[PDB]
Design a protein around this ligand. Structure first.
Ligand SMILES: COC(=O)[C@@H](N)Cc1ccccc1
Length: 330
């Protein structure tokens, strides 16, 4: 089997991407944030505290003939930005882009934090990291990808995120028309449950490439590119007037600037992030200070190749027995 679904930015900044997902019978379509940095499929639901729902589409298990309570199971998750959600669990039929999994754990939110409530465009998350990170207790559950794997033509999914435009998540096949050149594969460590890999270095603009190992995660659920302070300082030093603002919470730059590109290494290959991808616009409406798309990972504890980096590439998440990650230019 295979699946193919379009993923669409939620706003003009590509703050996140939403992908329609069919849950239950008859289908209930919810727009989920596909997140390679976590491993829970959770949704706003008929059980979500009413004051915490503001415009989201909800899953109602009582209206699905294939829903079954996963008796006694609960879940609770906290993300890197401090947001969180929790609730109970149903199994149901879940389809993405024509690919169907029966008996998928669908985690129904009873509570969500304010950041989720305030974002009316995201109806939940679909985790695509390793199932060892799944938070369901007392019986840990598998991700949609892990459940789908055995039916897939090939044990892979691909992320092809657009810049200010829709893109595609494919399951079970590599679309050789979706990228240019060849795919460079690199080793993955699953020790922390993430798609964790080591970049071979970086360049700023037209500058020389610095060969240096940068361990980080490929995370479609994180908006920005978070790298060591040394790297990030070297980037912003090339932008007149750029500075790190403790009041704003990161690097800002004059909205009049032209940003340099940023290159990262994948083995001997190179992925170039155009400067425009690094512009996240005014810090507040009408401001002449703009928020940077490359930020320091100091204090996070891990480097994160989020959407800013991933959208510059066609990315293969190879879930074979020995997992790997592939990157191609596009
Ligand atoms: C910082 O992002 C993260 O840790 C993402 N992996 C999960 C996330 C997505 C959307 C909202 C909140 C969290």
């Amino acid at each position: 089997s295979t699946g193919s679904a379009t993923t669409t930015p939620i706003d003009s900044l590509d703050d996140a991407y939403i992908t329609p997902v069919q849950i239950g019978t008859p289908a209930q379509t919810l727009n989920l944030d596909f997140d390679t940095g976590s491993s829970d499929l959770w949704v706003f639901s008929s059980e979500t505290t009413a004051s915490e729902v503001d415009g989201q589409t909800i899953y109602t298990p009582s209206k699905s003939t294939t829903a079954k309570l996963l008796s006694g199971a609960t879940w609770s998750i906290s993300y890197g930005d401090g947001s969180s959600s929790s609730g109970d669990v149903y199994t149901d039929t879940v389809s993405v882009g024509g690919l169907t999994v029966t008996g998928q754990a669908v985690e129904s939110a009873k509570k969500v934090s304010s950041s989720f409530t305030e974002d009316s465009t995201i109806d939940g998350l679909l985790g695509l990291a390793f199932s060892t990170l799944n938070t369901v207790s007392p019986t840990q559950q598998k991700t949609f990808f892990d459940n789908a794997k055995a039916s897939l033509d090939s044990p892979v999914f691909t992320a092809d995120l657009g810049y200010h435009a829709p893109g595609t998540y494919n399951f079970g096949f590599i679309d050789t028309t979706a990228y240019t050149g060849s795919i460079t594969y690199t080793a993955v460590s699953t020790k922390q449950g993430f798609w964790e890999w080591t970049s071979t270095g970086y360049a700023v603009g037209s500058g020389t490439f610095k060969s240096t190992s940068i361990d980080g995660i490929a995370d479609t659920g994180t908006t920005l590119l978070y790298l060591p302070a040394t790297v990030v300082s070297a980037y912003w030093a090339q932008v007149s007037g750029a500075k790190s603002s403790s009041s704003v919470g990161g690097y800002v730059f004059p909205c009049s600037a032209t940003l340099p590109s940023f290159t990262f290494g994948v083995g001997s290959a190179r992925i170039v992030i155009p400067g425009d991808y690094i512009d996240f616009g005014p810090i507040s409406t009408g401001s002449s200070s703009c928020f940077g798309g490359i930020q320091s990972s100091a204090g996070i504890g891990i480097n994160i190749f989020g959407d800013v980096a991933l959208k510059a590439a066609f990315v293969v998440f190879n879930g074979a027995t020995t997992p790997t990650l592939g990157f191609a230019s596009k």
